[PDB]
Symmetry: C3
Subunit: 172 residues, 3 copies
């Protein structure tokens, strides 16, 4: 099975071109830097429209065959922040451990980490994980959860992915 | 106008069996650390799920509270339905609150994992479940209060700020 | 008033189940009986088993092992949620936390805990190392939780794990 990783930036302003997407860039740069195995990327930038988020996640998993989808944006307390809701809506099983750890890690930086509603779940053979917005926060987040990602994908029947032990160790 | 609701959910407190030291502890905490004008909507009710839901809704919808702090009814016993009532009236929950509150509470109380305290949003009002003991109330508040004012900003609620020497309310600055 | 504890191994020798039984026998100092069940990874059968133990055998505590991962057939958490009327988020939170110390993949665990009548049900992992850290972390609050839901009296050896009360 070929590894295809989805990167979805959820932001009205970003989708309107009001500002450049440094978040999606940070995610792709991180993946290219740590993943040893071969893989393709399916990048998407969309406004925070609930239906568009769900339709986009489903397209990447079902039609593009992504084994992993990383989202960035729309995970705070504000009413328009519906990325977690969209994620739950397309997944059959949620993984509470992801949200717990990502908040734990963020707490080391700022107390507002408890306002994050980022989560993760499974849709078929695809793992979907909600990431933060800031490039630095994205890096710290992935260093924390990436070690468990390749194995999780193995368990749901997704493509094989491995990372550079000197960068981040994919625990198996 | 900043209006903060304080709801004590206790059958015995509502009947006049015990003095509400919990509610009093919360009000004293608020007055001690908040450095902006605010009014309090204090309520003491028995642990009746329907009444809890009606009270939270009234304080949020009619009294215009931007923050509601509850105390009591968050344990494993069948009658403790504060979390259930809170989830029922909120449109969006915030798992980080319950997570951190249980985390800072166990280093002292091993039964902290039995607490079902949570927090959520109803319109422009943040609702947070606190423990009963005045000691635990201060610990929980010192842990989550730093994020409360900003969370309220984000949901369109009233402006609240705290004495940085007591509690630092973190807010991103340009 | 009799203390009965259920131990359910969920998987299509039972090291994991043995570990739990040994733990219970080692730390509990009060009289109690164990109802042991080994069943396949079928949600309905898991649900019926938990109900049989809680309702018919009168268990005050049920500890499960297996079926808590991300795979499609790991449905223990779903079955547990289905039979309980009140869930305890604090359990899964702490168990994943202590487990994460050696197992990075601990965040893939969907273990939880809930209450069905006067019975507390807790999902444990499959590996002995994880089962131990998990029990050492939550057992201190189990006897008291059982008291609060009206279950049987259980107490532990203070030199192994102190049950708060």
């Amino acid at each position: 099975k070929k590894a295809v990783i989805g990167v979805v930036t959820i932001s009205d302003r970003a989708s309107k071109g009001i500002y450049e997407d440094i978040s999606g860039k940070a995610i792709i740069d991180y993946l290219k830097d740590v993943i040893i195995t071969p893989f393709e990327v399916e990048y998407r930038v969309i406004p925070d429209e609930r239906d568009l988020i769900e339709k986009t996640l489903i397209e990447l998993a079902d039609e593009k065959g992504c084994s992993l989808i990383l989202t960035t944006g729309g995970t705070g307390p504000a009413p328009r922040d519906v990325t977690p809701e969209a994620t739950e809506a397309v997944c059959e099983k949620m993984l509470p451990g992801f949200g717990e750890l990502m908040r734990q890690v963020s707490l080391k930086q700022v107390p507002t980490a408890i306002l994050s509603r980022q989560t993760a779940g499974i849709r078929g053979s695809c793992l979907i994980v909600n990431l933060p917005g800031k490039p630095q926060s994205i890096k710290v987040c992935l260093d924390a959860v990436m070690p468990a990602i390749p194995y999780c994908i193995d368990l749901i029947g997704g493509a094989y992915i491995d990372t550079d032990p000197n960068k981040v160790k994919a625990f198996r």
